[PDB]
Design a protein around this ligand. Structure first.
Ligand SMILES: Nc1nc2c(ncn2[C@@H]2O[C@H](COP(=O)(O)OP(=O)(O)NP(=O)(O)O)[C@@H](O)[C@H]2O)c(=O)[nH]1
Ligand SMILES: [Mg+2]
Lengths: 146, 206, 344
């Protein structure tokens, strides 16, 4: 109809949720599409994991830097892991706007899980802006410990 | 932590499962693999009034309407009836799904979804749709494949159940990821896969 | 010779108590049963096992109605139970008709099916409607049926006559294989592959490479797929291959205006048309084609008892509507449908 009317089933107070990204930083932010890779399928394939803004964040209280991405409209997290020393961005076959890497512990599902990601950008020039930024963040982190 | 039992219903091949899959993974399953009986899948969303969880009951579209499938409906609190915009038969069945439903649930928020609006040769045009007028339902064109309006159903339902016409989805606490140390016997064989990936091209859909 | 528990909505998990067993008392004392109907109940694995033992003893069984017997059953049970049941059916030499419709199958339960459909030579009428097969399992079922033709020939068995397989999303993906199945059974009388997501290239192949070889075809229903001009031209070329066609169902096929004109033109060239029911709803058919169809029906379709044109692109008020009604009135036999939903 124009607007069906119903009586609420519950009453919930207005609430203020934290992003848990306030002690943030935010070195990089940019629109992109993320891909998860196959699994125990034995049929190596790239499944979409989300489309949205990727962001690099370094902690102020510490030195830790991580990758964090959220899906459009729904705002669910689709990638959240630290950037370790032994982590790069090897290109993906053809293309010029796609990078692929590994992570021993993504926490998108708030459950520790190894992941073999891959992210694409609109222009190959953006892929570079992200790649360059990623490289240095990885560098700074390499220095960090000892 | 609030919870809502939502019944997902509709004819076979309409996209019920593909729809749920996208919401809890982000992937778009292109293989049709019929659902047997029912599969319960939990989906949570963060709103300005806190996190809410929908326990979605994805049901099978081959089972005849009847008392045999009352367990799925019993104590439901909302529902989604799906049909395929490229199949008139699929649409003609909506009235049967919406009836079997109200027979045991009575008055509960229900949204009708016309899936596959991405396909070119459309049969059931948005104009034609009127059923929602007679049955006090909300309607939405959607496409699990392109994501068109893919989040509307859950949002509308939340507003009716919670009672806030202006409730909206927000952020999502971004907890800290695990340590990540190791390297010994763990290293090496990693790069083996990393290659098997930097080689396999990506589905150019953009 | 008839056992039935139709529509009893029984939740059959085990069949062990003195009661329960009583339910199947007739099935036990009468080995002469010719028909068994289990529809409208939910059979668990254990109960399936008990029924298999008792069904294989029915050596004179001719019909098995196993449609709608697994509602509420999960992927944990259906495949097992189905295997037990179809295992017993293979042991019935006179079983010419089997119905397995309205059961959630899909690939996850294709095993028993593929097994059965390829070795049951007595089969004559197959009902595998609304089962959620899919293009993968659908292609496999199609191949299994090709096998059946070979095993039938090796035992001088009766031809397969009916295949009712719709609402399974066979899609374009399994049409190369289905075309081959129809090549294997050229004495089919009834075939309905309604609402399977089949598209133009699909319909084109299916027609010219499949159904076109079934010269004895009597009933054909492809409702709710997508023909457009491609499928339409295929249909136009194929009609001359079904001399005894009696029912042609093309509702919801988006034949398109140009396509419909081509089909109507085809009927125009046929001779001795014994067509009895013609379904052409929602096809974007335009007034011009409807005009010629009217006159083709007047001069060449003397047995037409039902026509269906609702949902097309012409006015319910146009002249032809009355002219058509006039034809049926003058004959004292004929019938047009309610044109209460014309397009545009
Ligand atoms: N092009 C397109 N195809 C879609 C869309 N969403 C789903 N599909 C396709 O629809 C098919 C079946 O979807 P699925 O979710 O398995 O159907 P179901 O509703 O769960 N059927 P069932 O009751 O038998 O379990 C798959 O091939 C899937 O890729 C869409 O928006 N567009
Ligand atoms: Mg499903």
């Amino acid at each position: 109809n124009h607007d069906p009317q119903f009586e609420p089933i519950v009453s919930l107070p207005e609430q203020e949720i934290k992003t848990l990204e306030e002690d943030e930083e935010e070195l990089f932010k940019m629109r992109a599409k993320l891909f998860r890779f196959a699994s125990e399928n034995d049929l190596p394939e790239w499944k979409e994991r989300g489309t949205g803004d990727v962001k690099l964040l370094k902690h102020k209280e510490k030195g830790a830097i991580r990758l964090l991405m959220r899906r459009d409209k729904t705002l669910k997290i689709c990638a959240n892991h630290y950037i370790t020393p032994m982590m790069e961005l090897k290109p993906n076959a053809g293309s010029d706007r796609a990078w692929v890497w590994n992570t021993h512990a993504d926490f998108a599902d708030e459950c520790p899980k190894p992941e073999l990601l891959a992210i694409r950008f609109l222009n190959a020039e953006n892929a570079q802006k992200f790649k360059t930024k990623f490289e240095e963040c990885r560098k700074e982190i390499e220095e960090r410990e000892k | 932590q609030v919870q809502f039992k939502l019944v997902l219903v509709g004819d076979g091949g309409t996209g019920k499962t593909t729809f749920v899959k996208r919401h809890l993974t982000g992937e778009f399953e292109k293989k049709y693999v019929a659902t047997l009986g029912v599969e319960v899948h939990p989906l949570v969303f963060h709103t300005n009034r806190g996190p809410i969880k929908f326990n979605v009951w994805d049901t099978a579209g081959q089972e005849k309407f009847g008392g045999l499938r009352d367990g799925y409906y019993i104590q439901a609190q909302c529902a989604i009836i799906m049909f395929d915009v490229t199949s008139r038969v699929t649409y003609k069945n909506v009235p049967n799904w919406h009836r079997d439903l109200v027979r045991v649930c009575e008055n509960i928020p229900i949204v009708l979804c016309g899936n596959k609006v991405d396909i070119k040769d459309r049969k059931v045009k948005a104009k034609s749709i009127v059923f929602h007028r007679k049955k006090n339902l909300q309607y939405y064109d959607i496409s699990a494949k392109s994501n068109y309006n893919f989040e509307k159903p859950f949002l509308w339902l939340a507003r009716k159940l919670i009672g806030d016409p202006n409730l909206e989805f927000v952020a999502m606490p971004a907890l800290a990821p695990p340590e990540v140390v190791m390297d010994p016997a763990l290293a090496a064989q990693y790069e083996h896969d990393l290659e098997v990936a930097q080689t396999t091209a990506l589905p150019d859909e953009d | 010779a008839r056992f039935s528990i139709e529509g009893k909505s029984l939740k059959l998990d085990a069949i062990t108590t003195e009661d329960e067993k009583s339910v199947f008392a007739v099935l036990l004392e009468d080995d002469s049963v010719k028909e068994i109907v289990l529809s409208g109940n939910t059979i668990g694995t254990e109960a399936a096992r008990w029924l298999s033992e008792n069904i294989a003893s029915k050596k004179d069984l001719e019909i098995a109605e196993f449609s709608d017997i697994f509602t509420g059953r999960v992927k944990d049970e259906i495949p097992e139970a189905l295997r037990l049941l179809l295992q017993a059916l293979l042991k019935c030499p006179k079983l010419h008709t089997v119905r397995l419709s309205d059961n959630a199958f899909g690939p996850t339960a294709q095993e028993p099916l593929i097994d059965f459909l390829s070795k049951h030579t007595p089969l004559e009428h197959l009902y595998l409607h609304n089962n959620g097969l899919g293009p993968q399992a659908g292609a496999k079922i199609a191949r299994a049926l090709q096998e059946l033709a070979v095993n039938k020939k090796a035992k001088n068995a009766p031809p397969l006559r009916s295949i009712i397989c719709g609402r399974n999303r066979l899609e374009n993906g399994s049409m190369k294989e289905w075309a081959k199945t129809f090549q294997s059974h050229r004495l089919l009388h009834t075939v309905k592959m309604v609402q399977n997501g089949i598209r133009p290239e699909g319909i084109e192949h299916l027609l010219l490479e499949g159904l076109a070889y079934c010269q004895e075809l009597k009933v054909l229903d492809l409702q709710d797929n997508t023909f457009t001009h491609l499928g339409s031209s295929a249909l136009a070329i194929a009609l001359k291959s079904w001399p005894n066609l009696r029912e042609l169902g093309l509702n919801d096929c988006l034949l398109s205006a140009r396509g419909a004109a081509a089909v109507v033109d085809a009927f125009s060239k046929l001779e001795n048309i014994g067509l009895q029911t013609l379904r052409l709803q929602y096809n974007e058919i335009e007034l011009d084609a409807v005009r010629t169809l009217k006159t083709v029906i007047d001069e060449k379709m003397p047995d037409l008892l039902f026509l269906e044109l609702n949902g097309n692109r012409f006015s319910e008020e146009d002249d032809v509507v009355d002219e058509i009604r006039e034809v049926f009135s003058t004959r004292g036999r004929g019938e047009l449908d309610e044109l209460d939903d014309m397009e545009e």
